[PDB]
A paper describes a structure:
The biological degradation of water-soluble gallotannins, such as tannic acid, is initiated by tannase enzymes (EC 3.1.1.20), which are esterases able to liberate gallic acid from aromatic-sugar complexes. Here, for the first time, we biochemically and structurally characterize three tannases from a single organism, the anaerobic bacterium Clostridium butyricum, which inhabits both soil and gut environments. In each structure, the catalytic triad and gallate-binding regions in the core domain were found in very similar positions in the active site compared with other bacterial tannases, suggesting a similar mechanism of action among these enzymes, though large inserts in each enzyme showcase overall structural diversity. Furthermore, we solved the structure of one of the enzymes (CbTan2) using X-ray crystallography and have modeled the structures of the other two enzymes (CbTan1 and 3) for comparative analyses.
The crystal structure of CbTan2 was solved to 2.22 Å resolution and conformed to the expected α/β hydrolase fold, while also possessing a cap covering the active site as seen in the two previously solved bacterial tannase structures. The apo structure of CbTan2 contained two protein molecules in the asymmetric unit. A single peak was observed using size-exclusion chromatography, and comparison to a calibration curve revealed that the protein was monomeric in solution (calculated MW ≈ 51 kDa versus expected MW ≈ 55 kDa), which suggests that the dimer observed in the structure is crystallographic and not of biological relevance. The overall structure adopted the α/β hydrolase fold (6 α-helices and 8 β-sheets) with multiple inserts that formed additional 12 helices and five β-sheets, which is similar to the additional inserts observed in other crystallized bacterial tannases. A hairpin-style cap region over the active site was identified in CbTan2, formed by residues 237 to 258, and comprised of two antiparallel β-strands connected by a turn in a hairpin (β8 & 9), similar to the cap identified in TanLp. It appears that the cap of CbTan2 adopts a similar shape and may also be flexible to help accommodate very large substrates, such as environmentally derived tannins that are more complex than the model substrates used here. The catalytic triad of CbTan2 could be identified as Ser175, Asp439, and His471, which is consistent with the enzyme being a subtype B tannase, i.e., possessing a catalytic Asp residue. The catalytic serine residue is found in the sequence motif G-X-S-X-G (Gly173-Thr174-Ser175-Ala176-Gly177), which is conserved across bacterial tannases. In CbTan2, the oxyanion hole appears to be formed by the backbone nitrogen atoms of Gly74 and Ala176. A disulfide bridge was observed between C320 and C332 in both chains; however, residues 321 to 331 (α7 to η4) could not be modeled in chain B due to lack of electron density in this region.
Author numbering: 1 to 115, 136 to 490
The structure:
Amino acid sequence: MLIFDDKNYKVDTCNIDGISIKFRSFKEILYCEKPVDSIQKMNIFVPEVYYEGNTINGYSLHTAPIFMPNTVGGYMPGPADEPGKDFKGRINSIFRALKHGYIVVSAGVRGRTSGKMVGRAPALVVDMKAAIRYLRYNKGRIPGNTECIVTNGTSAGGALSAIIGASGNSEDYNPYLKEIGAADERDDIFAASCYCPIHNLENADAAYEWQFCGYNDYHRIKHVRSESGVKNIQIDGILTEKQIKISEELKRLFPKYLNSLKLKDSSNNELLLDENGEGSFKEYIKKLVINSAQKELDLCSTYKIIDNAAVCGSKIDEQEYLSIEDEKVVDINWDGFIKKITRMKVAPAFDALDLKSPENEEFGTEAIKAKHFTAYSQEHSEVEGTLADPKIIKLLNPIEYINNSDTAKYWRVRHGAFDRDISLAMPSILSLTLENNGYVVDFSLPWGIPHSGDYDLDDLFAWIDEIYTK
C-alpha cells in the first residue's frame, strides 16, 4: 500500500566545507505497488526548521516548491540520491536546494542495464511519472507543494525532464503504469529544467550530419568515474569512406523532417531548409551562436574599458571566426566555428549500424539486447537487427507531446555552444516548438560550455523563485 508515513523519518545534518544543512529525511520509499527492480525507490528531504514554523526565502512547510533532480546519464539506471558531493567533488543540487528552501524528492528510476532486462524504454519515464503520482496520491501528508513540481536533469536526464514536462497525463503510458501498480493520479508538473537534453533520438542522426557532414575528423573524451581510481578514454579519428557516404546520406534526410514541424521565429517567419540544408532555419541557428558570442563579448568588452590590457574569458575577442565591428558580433564564419568545436561522433551518431550505441540498447527489450530506431539504420544495418516499435520510440520524444497534452507552462533549457554530443538543432527545435505553442521558455546557448549540467544553480533557483510569483 502506498500511504505516506510522516512519522518514519530521521533528522540529519550534512556539513561540507563548513557549510551546514539540517533536514528531515524519509528514505527508501517504495513508490509503486508492484516494483520489478530494487531501484524503484525515492527519498524525500525537508528543511528541518520548517517544522518549527520557520520560512526560507518566504517559503513554508506546505508552500515550498518540490525540486525533483534525477541521476540518469547515458540512459543508465538512475538511483535515488542524498545531500552531499557529486562525482566531480562539488556540493550537489540536493544540498543547495534544501539550503535554498525547497522540498527535494530524489526518485530512483530503472535504466537499460536493470536486471531479465526490465529497464529499457520506456521504463525511465514511467518510473518518474509513478514517483510524481505517489506524491500526488499523498498530497495531504507530503511536505511541500505538489502544484510546484520542478524537474531537473543533465544529458539523458535532461531528456527525462523534458518528456515529463511535455507529456503530462498522456494515456500512452497507462499500460506500463498499471503494470508496476502505480497510483491512479495526474503526473503533470509545474516547470521543467533541462541541461543538454539528449532527446528526439529518431531524428538526431540526420540532424547531426546536417551539422557535421564535411567535417571528418572526430574527437571524443570519455570520463568513466569510480570511487578511488580513474579511467580516461580519448578517441581521435577520421571517418571511413563508408562513413563519409553515410554522413552525406543522413544529411539529406534532415530538411524534409525540419520543414514538417512548421516552426516560426518570433517574427512569424517560417523556418525552413532546402535540400542542401541551407535557408531560414540555418540563419536562425547561426544567429543563436552569434548571440551566444555577443553575450560573452559583452563581459570582455566592459572588463576592458578598465585596464584594457586584460584578456577575457573564452578569449572571445580573439576568436578568428567571429566578425567583430564596434564591440558587436556582426557575422560569423560558420565553417570556422564548426572547425573550432569539431565533430565528436561518427556517422550515424546515435542509431549505430552495428547496434552498439547506448541508444540502441535503450531501445532493446526484455529479451533483445538492442534494436534500431530509424528507417535508415535498419535498412543499412551491418548486423541482423529489428526495428523498435514506433509506439515505444514515441514514448521518449517530448516533441511528440507538446500541443496535445498537459505540458508544463514554464521551461528552462541550457545547451553549451561547445557541446557536440548532439546537434545544436535539437535544443532549438525543443525551444521553438514550445514557444510556437504558447509556452514560456528561457533558452540559452552558453558560450564555451561543453557537455555538462548544473553549472548555474543560483540562476536556476532564481528562475524557480520568479515563476513561482507569476
